[PDB]
Amino acid sequence: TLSIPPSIQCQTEAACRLITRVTGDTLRAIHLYGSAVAGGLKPNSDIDLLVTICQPLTEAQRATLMQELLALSSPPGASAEKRALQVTVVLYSQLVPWCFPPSREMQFGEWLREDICQGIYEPAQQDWDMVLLITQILETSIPLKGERAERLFTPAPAAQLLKALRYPLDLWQSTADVQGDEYHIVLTLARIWYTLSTGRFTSKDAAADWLLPQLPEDYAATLRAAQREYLGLEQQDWHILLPAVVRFVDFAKAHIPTQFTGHHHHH
Ligand SMILES: CN[C@@H]1[C@H](O[C@H]2[C@H](O[C@H]3[C@H](O)[C@@H](O)[C@H](NC(=N)N)[C@@H](O)[C@@H]3NC(=N)N)O[C@@H](C)[C@]2(O)CO)O[C@@H](CO)[C@H](O)[C@H]1O
Ligand SMILES: Nc1ncnc2c1ncn2[C@@H]1O[C@H](COP(=O)(O)OP(=O)(O)OP(=O)(O)O)[C@@H](O)[C@H]1O
Ligand SMILES: [Ca+2]
Ligand SMILES: [Cl-]
C-alpha cells in the first residue's frame, strides 16, 4: 500500500488498458490519485487519472480516446458499479523541467459529456491546477503504468505552489462565479486554507472539520451546510444560501494566508 480500492479495480484496469492501447508509443506513465488513494471515496466520487505522454496526440488519437472514455465512464451517482472518470493528459516536457503555469494537453470528465459527445474537445491550455495535481501525486498516488511519481516528477518551488493555491481564490469573486458549484467551492476554500496554514493536503471532509472551530458561527454554519450536503446527509437549496456563500467566499479571501504559515511549508 498505497492500495487501489477493490471496488474500483475492474474499471480502473479497463481505463488503464484503453489509455495504453490508444496512446501507443507516446505513453510515459499513468497515475491514479485523488480520493480513491488519499481517502474520502464517496458514492458520487470520480476516479482521478493522470496520463503523462511524450509527444502530443494526433487528432485521431484524441478523438478515439474521448469517444471510448465516454463508454467507460458514467455520470456521477448513476451507478455504484461504474463511476465517473476524470482523465487529464500532460506532456512530460511541461513538468520536467517545469513550465509555469503548466499546460494540460486534454481533459476528459463527465461535466463535459454533452460537448464530448458531439466531438467538441477542450484544446490544450494553461492550468495552474496542474501544479496542485502533480504536488498531490508526489505525495499520494499509484503508478498504473510507468514509474512511481517520485522517480518521474520533481516538486515545484514553494513560490509557484503558493501562486497555484491562490489563483482560484483570487478568481472567485461574483455570484455567477460560484453558482452551480456552491458546496464544492466552499469545501475547496477550506482545503486551500488548510494547505496554506499547514503545508499539507487533506480531504474535503477533514478540511471542513479543521476549519469549522476557527470560524465565527455564521461562516461555520455555511461550511457545515456544504459539508453535510457533500456527505449525503441533506441537499440544501443553494439559491437561498447564495448570499451567505458569497459572504463565505469574501471571508476566505480576506483571511486565508498570503504566504505559507516558517516551518510549515509543504515538504
Ligand atoms: C477539473 N475538475 C472538475 C472541475 O473542477 C474545478 C472547479 O471549477 C469550477 C469553478 O470552481 C467555478 O468557479 C466555475 N464557475 C464559473 N466559471 N462561473 C466552474 O465553471 C468551474 N468548473 C469547470 N470549469 N468545469 O473548481 C476548481 C477548484 C476545480 O475543482 C479544479 O479542478 O469542475 C467541476 C465542476 O464545476 C467538476 O466536478 C470537477 O471534476
Ligand atoms: N489545497 C487543495 N487541496 C486539495 N485539492 C485542491 C486544493 N486546492 C485546489 N484543489 C483542487 O481541487 C480539485 C479536487 O479534485 P476532486 O474534486 O476530484 O477531489 P477529491 O479529493 O478527489 O474528492 P472527490 O471524492 O469528491 O472526487 C483538484 O483540481 C485539486 O487540485
Ligand atoms: Ca476525485
Ligand atoms: Cl475512503
Author numbering: 2 to 262, 264 to 269
Could you share sentences copied from the article?
Modification of streptomycin and spectinomycin by O-phosphorylation or O-nucleotidylation prevents the drugs from binding to their respective binding sites on the ribosome (for reviews, see Refs. 9 and 10). In the apo state, AadA has a monomeric two-domain structure with the active site located between an N-terminal adenylyltransferase domain and a C-terminal helical domain.
The structure of AadA(E87Q) with ATP and streptomycin (AadA(E87Q)–ATP–sry) was refined to 1.73-Å resolution, and the structure of AadA(E87Q) with ATP and dihydrostreptomycin (AadA(E87Q)–ATP–dhs) was resolved to 1.4-Å resolution. The overall structure of AadA(E87Q)–ATP–dhs is very similar to AadA–ATP (r.m.s.d. of 0.3 Å over 252 Cα atoms). Dihydrostreptomycin is bound between the two domains of AadA with the C ring sandwiched between the two domains in proximity of ATP, whereas the B- and A rings extend further toward the surface and form their major interactions with the C-terminal domain. AadA hides 417 Å2 (58%) of the van der Waals area of dihydrostreptomycin and makes interactions with all three rings. The C ring is the site of modification and is situated in proximity of the suggested catalytic base Glu-87 (mutated to glutamine in the structure) with the 3″-hydroxyl situated in the closest position. Furthermore, the ring is also oriented through a hydrogen bond of Asp-182 with the 6″-hydroxyl group and a stacking interaction with Trp-112. In turn, the B ring is oriented by His-185 through a hydrogen bond with the 3′-hydroxyl group. Hydrogen bond interactions occur between Trp-173 and hydroxyl groups at positions 5 and 6, between the backbone carbonyl of Ala-177 and the guanidinium group at position 1, and between the backbone carbonyl of Asp-178 and the 6-hydroxyl group.
